[PDB]
């Protein structure tokens, strides 16, 4: 009757909540995040960072990501930290990834204050958030990436915790676009009308091999990189299934560890956010948290 779309995780799934905390020591809402500790109270919680999907367009949707995936993470026993990032329309790449990295230095540096054990900081996201999650899980320890004559600052200088590591320990990628060389028909780059074109500054990806390489985490997968779980629906009409197939193939051929879960009849979210696959995520994140 009076209806309210779910805003953040349900109230009974957490004991403690800090909302609209800035992680960049500035005044931008694109640089805020929210933190939730489980109901089952403990001395410390290992942490999972989450990122909304939005074709990189949104800068204010951390409550959607919380509402979608936060409850199973809280019930599994992890602190859940949901972040904002800047819109592709207000800062082109690498801005989004510098935001994620800054958010990570924030969580790790201040873990104690939030009763976070920084022993483990996993990361997850859906769609473009899954992209950003994955881009972090293949760039632990990297401050710039260069392709041809193009150089991008991945770590950035955002905020006041630059000495703290900006690394993540495990990744769950929910149907993210991770191979932009093959987004069109799964064989080619898209044209300049698409969200990756805006991400690289309204250039035609078909003309920009270097930009396309440096927004595509599939290009940096290494044997030693943190393990990853990839979940994609085989009827996804927005980001094609082939993306996740490719990412898994690359993890497999580089000597790294990827699990790929394909969701039959799964849309771009629909059918994928079932108990079954939330469990795949929480089981994964638990095994990683303990190993």
PDB file of C-alpha atoms in Angstrom:
ATOM      1  CA  UNK A   1       0.000   0.000   0.000  1.00  0.00           C
ATOM      2  CA  UNK A   2       2.529   2.453   1.247  1.00  0.00           C
ATOM      3  CA  UNK A   3       5.427   0.605  -0.379  1.00  0.00           C
ATOM      4  CA  UNK A   4       9.181   1.174  -0.025  1.00  0.00           C
ATOM      5  CA  UNK A   5      11.752  -0.549  -2.238  1.00  0.00           C
ATOM      6  CA  UNK A   6      14.313  -2.327   0.040  1.00  0.00           C
ATOM      7  CA  UNK A   7      16.834   0.327   1.221  1.00  0.00           C
ATOM      8  CA  UNK A   8      19.906  -1.283   2.737  1.00  0.00           C
ATOM      9  CA  UNK A   9      19.807  -4.681   4.405  1.00  0.00           C
ATOM     10  CA  UNK A  10      16.781  -5.573   6.519  1.00  0.00           C
ATOM     11  CA  UNK A  11      16.943  -4.239  10.074  1.00  0.00           C
ATOM     12  CA  UNK A  12      17.210  -7.586  11.886  1.00  0.00           C
ATOM     13  CA  UNK A  13      20.237  -8.783   9.894  1.00  0.00           C
ATOM     14  CA  UNK A  14      22.698  -6.436  11.610  1.00  0.00           C
ATOM     15  CA  UNK A  15      23.640  -5.249  15.088  1.00  0.00           C
ATOM     16  CA  UNK A  16      25.463  -2.120  13.984  1.00  0.00           C
ATOM     17  CA  UNK A  17      25.171   0.346  11.141  1.00  0.00           C
ATOM     18  CA  UNK A  18      27.245   3.381  10.090  1.00  0.00           C
ATOM     19  CA  UNK A  19      25.847   5.170   7.037  1.00  0.00           C
ATOM     20  CA  UNK A  20      27.208   7.809   4.690  1.00  0.00           C
ATOM     21  CA  UNK A  21      30.758   7.563   5.975  1.00  0.00           C
ATOM     22  CA  UNK A  22      33.187   9.352   3.645  1.00  0.00           C
ATOM     23  CA  UNK A  23      36.247   7.360   2.633  1.00  0.00           C
ATOM     24  CA  UNK A  24      38.122  10.024   0.634  1.00  0.00           C
ATOM     25  CA  UNK A  25      38.295  12.763   3.288  1.00  0.00           C
ATOM     26  CA  UNK A  26      36.200  15.054   1.113  1.00  0.00           C
ATOM     27  CA  UNK A  27      32.605  16.242   0.781  1.00  0.00           C
ATOM     28  CA  UNK A  28      31.420  14.079  -2.144  1.00  0.00           C
ATOM     29  CA  UNK A  29      28.560  11.610  -1.787  1.00  0.00           C
ATOM     30  CA  UNK A  30      30.221   9.576  -4.571  1.00  0.00           C
ATOM     31  CA  UNK A  31      32.906   8.914  -1.914  1.00  0.00           C
ATOM     32  CA  UNK A  32      30.613   7.671   0.853  1.00  0.00           C
ATOM     33  CA  UNK A  33      30.028   4.134   2.047  1.00  0.00           C
ATOM     34  CA  UNK A  34      27.901   2.227   4.562  1.00  0.00           C
ATOM     35  CA  UNK A  35      29.036  -0.419   7.087  1.00  0.00           C
ATOM     36  CA  UNK A  36      27.014  -3.179   8.739  1.00  0.00           C
ATOM     37  CA  UNK A  37      28.063  -5.729  11.343  1.00  0.00           C
ATOM     38  CA  UNK A  38      26.139  -8.987  11.710  1.00  0.00           C
ATOM     39  CA  UNK A  39      23.383  -9.614  14.238  1.00  0.00           C
ATOM     40  CA  UNK A  40      25.303 -12.521  15.752  1.00  0.00           C
ATOM     41  CA  UNK A  41      27.692 -10.253  17.637  1.00  0.00           C
ATOM     42  CA  UNK A  42      31.425 -11.019  17.815  1.00  0.00           C
ATOM     43  CA  UNK A  43      34.657  -9.274  18.736  1.00  0.00           C
ATOM     44  CA  UNK A  44      35.789  -8.936  15.137  1.00  0.00           C
ATOM     45  CA  UNK A  45      34.249  -9.543  11.744  1.00  0.00           C
ATOM     46  CA  UNK A  46      36.098 -10.241   8.549  1.00  0.00           C
ATOM     47  CA  UNK A  47      34.960  -7.817   5.867  1.00  0.00           C
ATOM     48  CA  UNK A  48      33.290  -8.014   2.434  1.00  0.00           C
ATOM     49  CA  UNK A  49      33.110  -4.877   0.266  1.00  0.00           C
ATOM     50  CA  UNK A  50      30.167  -4.686  -2.141  1.00  0.00           C
ATOM     51  CA  UNK A  51      29.592  -2.573  -5.253  1.00  0.00           C
ATOM     52  CA  UNK A  52      26.362  -1.843  -7.144  1.00  0.00           C
ATOM     53  CA  UNK A  53      25.972  -2.252 -10.916  1.00  0.00           C
ATOM     54  CA  UNK A  54      24.881   0.733 -12.969  1.00  0.00           C
ATOM     55  CA  UNK A  55      26.771   0.691 -16.258  1.00  0.00           C
ATOM     56  CA  UNK A  56      29.235   2.905 -14.314  1.00  0.00           C
ATOM     57  CA  UNK A  57      26.594   5.665 -14.448  1.00  0.00           C
ATOM     58  CA  UNK A  58      25.434   5.855 -10.829  1.00  0.00           C
ATOM     59  CA  UNK A  59      27.323   7.515  -7.968  1.00  0.00           C
ATOM     60  CA  UNK A  60      24.782   7.034  -5.149  1.00  0.00           C
ATOM     61  CA  UNK A  61      23.417   3.456  -5.235  1.00  0.00           C
ATOM     62  CA  UNK A  62      25.244   1.726  -2.357  1.00  0.00           C
ATOM     63  CA  UNK A  63      21.880   1.125  -0.628  1.00  0.00           C
ATOM     64  CA  UNK A  64      20.675  -0.906  -3.631  1.00  0.00           C
ATOM     65  CA  UNK A  65      23.723  -3.180  -3.440  1.00  0.00           C
ATOM     66  CA  UNK A  66      23.193  -3.622   0.320  1.00  0.00           C
ATOM     67  CA  UNK A  67      19.560  -4.520  -0.201  1.00  0.00           C
ATOM     68  CA  UNK A  68      20.407  -7.024  -2.941  1.00  0.00           C
ATOM     69  CA  UNK A  69      23.283  -9.013  -1.412  1.00  0.00           C
ATOM     70  CA  UNK A  70      24.033  -7.732   2.070  1.00  0.00           C
ATOM     71  CA  UNK A  71      21.729  -9.887   4.179  1.00  0.00           C
ATOM     72  CA  UNK A  72      23.282 -13.235   3.176  1.00  0.00           C
ATOM     73  CA  UNK A  73      26.768 -11.741   3.851  1.00  0.00           C
ATOM     74  CA  UNK A  74      25.733 -10.481   7.318  1.00  0.00           C
ATOM     75  CA  UNK A  75      24.089 -13.812   8.152  1.00  0.00           C
ATOM     76  CA  UNK A  76      27.206 -15.658   6.978  1.00  0.00           C
ATOM     77  CA  UNK A  77      29.180 -13.663   9.587  1.00  0.00           C
ATOM     78  CA  UNK A  78      30.935 -10.926   7.610  1.00  0.00           C
ATOM     79  CA  UNK A  79      30.910  -7.198   8.010  1.00  0.00           C
ATOM     80  CA  UNK A  80      29.378  -5.674   4.872  1.00  0.00           C
ATOM     81  CA  UNK A  81      30.714  -2.395   3.492  1.00  0.00           C
ATOM     82  CA  UNK A  82      28.781  -0.963   0.515  1.00  0.00           C
ATOM     83  CA  UNK A  83      30.490   1.815  -1.431  1.00  0.00           C
ATOM     84  CA  UNK A  84      29.698   4.576  -3.858  1.00  0.00           C
ATOM     85  CA  UNK A  85      31.952   5.447  -6.812  1.00  0.00           C
ATOM     86  CA  UNK A  86      31.986   8.404  -9.176  1.00  0.00           C
ATOM     87  CA  UNK A  87      29.860   8.356 -12.304  1.00  0.00           C
ATOM     88  CA  UNK A  88      31.562   7.799 -15.658  1.00  0.00           C
ATOM     89  CA  UNK A  89      29.814  11.061 -16.604  1.00  0.00           C
ATOM     90  CA  UNK A  90      31.632  13.084 -13.944  1.00  0.00           C
ATOM     91  CA  UNK A  91      35.077  11.454 -14.038  1.00  0.00           C
ATOM     92  CA  UNK A  92      36.341   9.111 -16.737  1.00  0.00           C
ATOM     93  CA  UNK A  93      38.417   6.049 -16.028  1.00  0.00           C
ATOM     94  CA  UNK A  94      40.519   5.444 -14.060  1.00  0.00           C
ATOM     95  CA  UNK A  95      38.390   7.502 -11.627  1.00  0.00           C
ATOM     96  CA  UNK A  96      36.064   4.621 -10.660  1.00  0.00           C
ATOM     97  CA  UNK A  97      38.880   2.227  -9.792  1.00  0.00           C
ATOM     98  CA  UNK A  98      40.725   4.854  -7.768  1.00  0.00           C
ATOM     99  CA  UNK A  99      37.508   5.261  -5.798  1.00  0.00           C
ATOM    100  CA  UNK A 100      37.312   1.537  -5.062  1.00  0.00           C
ATOM    101  CA  UNK A 101      40.985   1.431  -4.041  1.00  0.00           C
ATOM    102  CA  UNK A 102      40.529   4.470  -1.765  1.00  0.00           C
ATOM    103  CA  UNK A 103      37.512   2.797  -0.181  1.00  0.00           C
ATOM    104  CA  UNK A 104      39.649  -0.252   0.489  1.00  0.00           C
ATOM    105  CA  UNK A 105      42.451   1.683   2.148  1.00  0.00           C
ATOM    106  CA  UNK A 106      39.761   3.285   4.285  1.00  0.00           C
ATOM    107  CA  UNK A 107      38.260   0.008   5.451  1.00  0.00           C
ATOM    108  CA  UNK A 108      41.661  -1.621   6.113  1.00  0.00           C
ATOM    109  CA  UNK A 109      43.119   1.380   7.952  1.00  0.00           C
ATOM    110  CA  UNK A 110      40.025   1.856  10.184  1.00  0.00           C
ATOM    111  CA  UNK A 111      39.083  -1.777  10.622  1.00  0.00           C
ATOM    112  CA  UNK A 112      39.538  -1.663  14.417  1.00  0.00           C
ATOM    113  CA  UNK A 113      37.176   1.282  14.890  1.00  0.00           C
ATOM    114  CA  UNK A 114      34.470  -0.749  13.124  1.00  0.00           C
ATOM    115  CA  UNK A 115      35.268  -4.097  14.736  1.00  0.00           C
ATOM    116  CA  UNK A 116      36.504  -5.325  11.397  1.00  0.00           C
ATOM    117  CA  UNK A 117      39.239  -7.883  11.282  1.00  0.00           C
ATOM    118  CA  UNK A 118      41.338  -6.730   8.266  1.00  0.00           C
ATOM    119  CA  UNK A 119      42.932 -10.190   8.124  1.00  0.00           C
ATOM    120  CA  UNK A 120      40.431 -10.663   5.281  1.00  0.00           C
ATOM    121  CA  UNK A 121      38.829  -8.103   2.950  1.00  0.00           C
ATOM    122  CA  UNK A 122      36.828  -9.781   0.157  1.00  0.00           C
ATOM    123  CA  UNK A 123      35.093  -7.852  -2.635  1.00  0.00           C
ATOM    124  CA  UNK A 124      32.001  -8.365  -4.761  1.00  0.00           C
ATOM    125  CA  UNK A 125      29.715  -6.500  -7.126  1.00  0.00           C
ATOM    126  CA  UNK A 126      27.180  -7.030  -9.850  1.00  0.00           C
ATOM    127  CA  UNK A 127      27.382  -5.906 -13.419  1.00  0.00           C
ATOM    128  CA  UNK A 128      29.742  -2.870 -13.500  1.00  0.00           C
ATOM    129  CA  UNK A 129      30.350  -3.410  -9.778  1.00  0.00           C
ATOM    130  CA  UNK A 130      31.454  -6.945 -10.625  1.00  0.00           C
ATOM    131  CA  UNK A 131      33.790  -5.366 -13.142  1.00  0.00           C
ATOM    132  CA  UNK A 132      35.235  -3.103 -10.476  1.00  0.00           C
ATOM    133  CA  UNK A 133      35.535  -5.928  -7.970  1.00  0.00           C
ATOM    134  CA  UNK A 134      37.399  -7.995 -10.574  1.00  0.00           C
ATOM    135  CA  UNK A 135      39.611  -5.108 -11.630  1.00  0.00           C
ATOM    136  CA  UNK A 136      40.751  -4.889  -8.002  1.00  0.00           C
ATOM    137  CA  UNK A 137      41.303  -8.621  -7.704  1.00  0.00           C
ATOM    138  CA  UNK A 138      43.817  -8.531 -10.586  1.00  0.00           C
ATOM    139  CA  UNK A 139      45.596  -5.296  -9.641  1.00  0.00           C
ATOM    140  CA  UNK A 140      46.642  -5.941  -6.034  1.00  0.00           C
ATOM    141  CA  UNK A 141      49.802  -3.914  -5.644  1.00  0.00           C
ATOM    142  CA  UNK A 142      49.656  -1.992  -8.934  1.00  0.00           C
ATOM    143  CA  UNK A 143      49.679   1.758  -9.056  1.00  0.00           C
ATOM    144  CA  UNK A 144      49.722   2.350 -12.835  1.00  0.00           C
ATOM    145  CA  UNK A 145      48.954   0.311 -15.933  1.00  0.00           C
ATOM    146  CA  UNK A 146      50.230   1.239 -19.400  1.00  0.00           C
ATOM    147  CA  UNK A 147      49.216   0.035 -22.874  1.00  0.00           C
ATOM    148  CA  UNK A 148      50.917   1.440 -25.913  1.00  0.00           C
ATOM    149  CA  UNK A 149      51.317   5.121 -25.134  1.00  0.00           C
ATOM    150  CA  UNK A 150      48.380   5.210 -22.688  1.00  0.00           C
ATOM    151  CA  UNK A 151      49.011   5.319 -18.936  1.00  0.00           C
ATOM    152  CA  UNK A 152      46.377   5.117 -16.186  1.00  0.00           C
ATOM    153  CA  UNK A 153      46.743   5.654 -12.439  1.00  0.00           C
ATOM    154  CA  UNK A 154      44.974   2.647 -10.848  1.00  0.00           C
ATOM    155  CA  UNK A 155      45.780   3.272  -7.158  1.00  0.00           C
ATOM    156  CA  UNK A 156      45.285   7.028  -7.173  1.00  0.00           C
ATOM    157  CA  UNK A 157      46.106   9.463  -4.360  1.00  0.00           C
ATOM    158  CA  UNK A 158      42.544   9.771  -2.969  1.00  0.00           C
ATOM    159  CA  UNK A 159      42.138  10.290   0.757  1.00  0.00           C
ATOM    160  CA  UNK A 160      44.357  10.095   3.783  1.00  0.00           C
ATOM    161  CA  UNK A 161      45.287   6.389   4.037  1.00  0.00           C
ATOM    162  CA  UNK A 162      47.688   6.059   1.066  1.00  0.00           C
ATOM    163  CA  UNK A 163      50.163   3.984   3.154  1.00  0.00           C
ATOM    164  CA  UNK A 164      47.594   1.294   3.833  1.00  0.00           C
ATOM    165  CA  UNK A 165      47.409  -1.564   1.381  1.00  0.00           C
ATOM    166  CA  UNK A 166      44.623  -1.273  -1.191  1.00  0.00           C
ATOM    167  CA  UNK A 167      44.411  -5.023  -1.818  1.00  0.00           C
ATOM    168  CA  UNK A 168      41.599  -7.551  -1.676  1.00  0.00           C
ATOM    169  CA  UNK A 169      41.777 -11.191  -0.735  1.00  0.00           C
ATOM    170  CA  UNK A 170      38.990 -12.805  -2.771  1.00  0.00           C
ATOM    171  CA  UNK A 171      36.465 -11.845  -5.467  1.00  0.00           C
ATOM    172  CA  UNK A 172      32.905 -12.746  -6.367  1.00  0.00           C
ATOM    173  CA  UNK A 173      31.970 -11.370  -9.816  1.00  0.00           C
ATOM    174  CA  UNK A 174      28.216 -11.270 -10.476  1.00  0.00           C
ATOM    175  CA  UNK A 175      27.801 -11.146 -14.252  1.00  0.00           C
ATOM    176  CA  UNK A 176      30.261  -8.307 -14.835  1.00  0.00           C
ATOM    177  CA  UNK A 177      31.555  -6.953 -18.154  1.00  0.00           C
ATOM    178  CA  UNK A 178      35.223  -7.920 -17.964  1.00  0.00           C
ATOM    179  CA  UNK A 179      36.321  -8.281 -21.646  1.00  0.00           C
ATOM    180  CA  UNK A 180      35.330  -5.209 -23.596  1.00  0.00           C
ATOM    181  CA  UNK A 181      37.188  -6.362 -26.718  1.00  0.00           C
ATOM    182  CA  UNK A 182      34.370  -8.911 -27.056  1.00  0.00           C
ATOM    183  CA  UNK A 183      31.223  -7.206 -25.764  1.00  0.00           C
ATOM    184  CA  UNK A 184      29.563  -6.769 -29.171  1.00  0.00           C
ATOM    185  CA  UNK A 185      28.164 -10.168 -30.316  1.00  0.00           C
ATOM    186  CA  UNK A 186      30.855 -11.631 -27.995  1.00  0.00           C
ATOM    187  CA  UNK A 187      33.396 -10.974 -30.792  1.00  0.00           C
ATOM    188  CA  UNK A 188      34.100  -7.241 -31.057  1.00  0.00           C
ATOM    189  CA  UNK A 189      34.238  -3.945 -29.158  1.00  0.00           C
ATOM    190  CA  UNK A 190      31.081  -1.835 -28.978  1.00  0.00           C
ATOM    191  CA  UNK A 191      30.636   1.512 -30.681  1.00  0.00           C
ATOM    192  CA  UNK A 192      30.808   4.932 -29.039  1.00  0.00           C
ATOM    193  CA  UNK A 193      27.141   4.959 -27.926  1.00  0.00           C
ATOM    194  CA  UNK A 194      27.615   2.381 -25.185  1.00  0.00           C
ATOM    195  CA  UNK A 195      28.476   2.708 -21.498  1.00  0.00           C
ATOM    196  CA  UNK A 196      32.105   1.623 -21.969  1.00  0.00           C
ATOM    197  CA  UNK A 197      32.482   4.442 -24.500  1.00  0.00           C
ATOM    198  CA  UNK A 198      31.437   6.969 -21.861  1.00  0.00           C
ATOM    199  CA  UNK A 199      33.718   5.222 -19.386  1.00  0.00           C
ATOM    200  CA  UNK A 200      36.686   5.981 -21.656  1.00  0.00           C
ATOM    201  CA  UNK A 201      35.541   9.512 -22.417  1.00  0.00           C
ATOM    202  CA  UNK A 202      33.119   9.226 -25.322  1.00  0.00           C
ATOM    203  CA  UNK A 203      35.650   7.548 -27.619  1.00  0.00           C
ATOM    204  CA  UNK A 204      34.802   4.648 -29.942  1.00  0.00           C
ATOM    205  CA  UNK A 205      36.120   1.474 -28.319  1.00  0.00           C
ATOM    206  CA  UNK A 206      36.536   0.026 -31.805  1.00  0.00           C
ATOM    207  CA  UNK A 207      39.256   2.647 -32.355  1.00  0.00           C
ATOM    208  CA  UNK A 208      40.874   2.378 -28.932  1.00  0.00           C
ATOM    209  CA  UNK A 209      42.636  -0.938 -28.303  1.00  0.00           C
ATOM    210  CA  UNK A 210      44.654   0.531 -25.448  1.00  0.00           C
ATOM    211  CA  UNK A 211      41.736   2.034 -23.568  1.00  0.00           C
ATOM    212  CA  UNK A 212      39.857  -1.222 -24.043  1.00  0.00           C
ATOM    213  CA  UNK A 213      42.753  -3.241 -22.640  1.00  0.00           C
ATOM    214  CA  UNK A 214      43.057  -1.062 -19.556  1.00  0.00           C
ATOM    215  CA  UNK A 215      39.358  -1.210 -18.575  1.00  0.00           C
ATOM    216  CA  UNK A 216      39.211  -4.991 -19.054  1.00  0.00           C
ATOM    217  CA  UNK A 217      40.416  -7.004 -16.028  1.00  0.00           C
ATOM    218  CA  UNK A 218      40.611 -10.125 -18.158  1.00  0.00           C
ATOM    219  CA  UNK A 219      43.945  -8.753 -19.485  1.00  0.00           C
ATOM    220  CA  UNK A 220      45.785  -8.851 -16.108  1.00  0.00           C
ATOM    221  CA  UNK A 221      44.942 -12.257 -14.610  1.00  0.00           C
ATOM    222  CA  UNK A 222      47.952 -13.933 -12.962  1.00  0.00           C
ATOM    223  CA  UNK A 223      48.563 -17.360 -11.408  1.00  0.00           C
ATOM    224  CA  UNK A 224      49.018 -15.742  -7.974  1.00  0.00           C
ATOM    225  CA  UNK A 225      45.984 -13.461  -8.080  1.00  0.00           C
ATOM    226  CA  UNK A 226      43.263 -13.934  -5.447  1.00  0.00           C
ATOM    227  CA  UNK A 227      40.783 -16.693  -6.165  1.00  0.00           C
ATOM    228  CA  UNK A 228      37.505 -15.674  -7.846  1.00  0.00           C
ATOM    229  CA  UNK A 229      33.922 -16.909  -8.052  1.00  0.00           C
ATOM    230  CA  UNK A 230      32.030 -15.905 -11.202  1.00  0.00           C
ATOM    231  CA  UNK A 231      28.239 -16.138 -11.378  1.00  0.00           C
ATOM    232  CA  UNK A 232      26.404 -15.384 -14.623  1.00  0.00           C
ATOM    233  CA  UNK A 233      22.935 -16.113 -16.016  1.00  0.00           C
ATOM    234  CA  UNK A 234      22.772 -17.898 -19.370  1.00  0.00           C
ATOM    235  CA  UNK A 235      19.858 -15.653 -20.451  1.00  0.00           C
ATOM    236  CA  UNK A 236      21.537 -12.386 -19.455  1.00  0.00           C
ATOM    237  CA  UNK A 237      20.350  -9.811 -21.985  1.00  0.00           C
ATOM    238  CA  UNK A 238      22.527  -6.891 -20.794  1.00  0.00           C
ATOM    239  CA  UNK A 239      26.027  -8.252 -20.259  1.00  0.00           C
ATOM    240  CA  UNK A 240      26.490 -11.471 -22.289  1.00  0.00           C
ATOM    241  CA  UNK A 241      27.295 -14.808 -20.652  1.00  0.00           C
ATOM    242  CA  UNK A 242      30.341 -15.127 -22.923  1.00  0.00           C
ATOM    243  CA  UNK A 243      32.093 -12.512 -20.768  1.00  0.00           C
ATOM    244  CA  UNK A 244      32.169 -14.777 -17.730  1.00  0.00           C
ATOM    245  CA  UNK A 245      33.058 -17.818 -19.863  1.00  0.00           C
ATOM    246  CA  UNK A 246      36.065 -15.902 -21.139  1.00  0.00           C
ATOM    247  CA  UNK A 247      37.146 -14.790 -17.672  1.00  0.00           C
ATOM    248  CA  UNK A 248      37.019 -18.331 -16.354  1.00  0.00           C
ATOM    249  CA  UNK A 249      38.945 -19.622 -19.359  1.00  0.00           C
ATOM    250  CA  UNK A 250      41.613 -17.006 -18.685  1.00  0.00           C
ATOM    251  CA  UNK A 251      41.826 -17.873 -14.981  1.00  0.00           C
ATOM    252  CA  UNK A 252      42.109 -21.530 -16.001  1.00  0.00           C
ATOM    253  CA  UNK A 253      44.891 -20.963 -18.576  1.00  0.00           C
ATOM    254  CA  UNK A 254      46.910 -18.608 -16.333  1.00  0.00           C
ATOM    255  CA  UNK A 255      47.166 -21.060 -13.456  1.00  0.00           C
ATOM    256  CA  UNK A 256      44.815 -19.125 -11.145  1.00  0.00           C
ATOM    257  CA  UNK A 257      41.676 -20.309  -9.391  1.00  0.00           C
ATOM    258  CA  UNK A 258      38.239 -19.423 -10.733  1.00  0.00           C
ATOM    259  CA  UNK A 259      34.889 -21.089 -10.100  1.00  0.00           C
ATOM    260  CA  UNK A 260      32.191 -20.367 -12.673  1.00  0.00           C
ATOM    261  CA  UNK A 261      28.512 -20.799 -11.830  1.00  0.00           C
ATOM    262  CA  UNK A 262      26.079 -20.438 -14.713  1.00  0.00           C
ATOM    263  CA  UNK A 263      22.472 -19.715 -13.763  1.00  0.00           C
ATOM    264  CA  UNK A 264      20.032 -21.392 -16.160  1.00  0.00           C
ATOM    265  CA  UNK A 265      17.328 -18.998 -17.312  1.00  0.00           C
ATOM    266  CA  UNK A 266      19.065 -16.345 -15.240  1.00  0.00           C
ATOM    267  CA  UNK A 267      18.622 -12.771 -16.375  1.00  0.00           C
ATOM    268  CA  UNK A 268      20.827  -9.826 -15.475  1.00  0.00           C
ATOM    269  CA  UNK A 269      20.002 -10.285 -11.790  1.00  0.00           C
ATOM    270  CA  UNK A 270      16.688 -12.123 -12.025  1.00  0.00           C
ATOM    271  CA  UNK A 271      17.043 -15.783 -11.026  1.00  0.00           C
ATOM    272  CA  UNK A 272      20.652 -15.215  -9.990  1.00  0.00           C
ATOM    273  CA  UNK A 273      19.819 -13.686  -6.583  1.00  0.00           C
ATOM    274  CA  UNK A 274      18.265 -16.949  -5.269  1.00  0.00           C
ATOM    275  CA  UNK A 275      19.218 -18.625  -1.994  1.00  0.00           C
ATOM    276  CA  UNK A 276      21.172 -21.253  -3.939  1.00  0.00           C
ATOM    277  CA  UNK A 277      23.581 -18.760  -5.435  1.00  0.00           C
ATOM    278  CA  UNK A 278      23.806 -16.533  -2.361  1.00  0.00           C
ATOM    279  CA  UNK A 279      25.055 -19.723  -0.702  1.00  0.00           C
ATOM    280  CA  UNK A 280      27.595 -20.260  -3.479  1.00  0.00           C
ATOM    281  CA  UNK A 281      28.884 -16.763  -2.629  1.00  0.00           C
ATOM    282  CA  UNK A 282      28.886 -17.152   1.169  1.00  0.00           C
ATOM    283  CA  UNK A 283      30.368 -20.667   1.105  1.00  0.00           C
ATOM    284  CA  UNK A 284      33.116 -19.308  -1.178  1.00  0.00           C
ATOM    285  CA  UNK A 285      33.789 -16.254   0.966  1.00  0.00           C
ATOM    286  CA  UNK A 286      33.912 -18.412   4.083  1.00  0.00           C
ATOM    287  CA  UNK A 287      36.375 -20.963   2.638  1.00  0.00           C
ATOM    288  CA  UNK A 288      38.564 -18.047   1.564  1.00  0.00           C
ATOM    289  CA  UNK A 289      38.242 -16.266   4.937  1.00  0.00           C
ATOM    290  CA  UNK A 290      39.544 -19.370   6.726  1.00  0.00           C
ATOM    291  CA  UNK A 291      42.204 -20.796   4.405  1.00  0.00           C
TER     292      UNK A 291
END
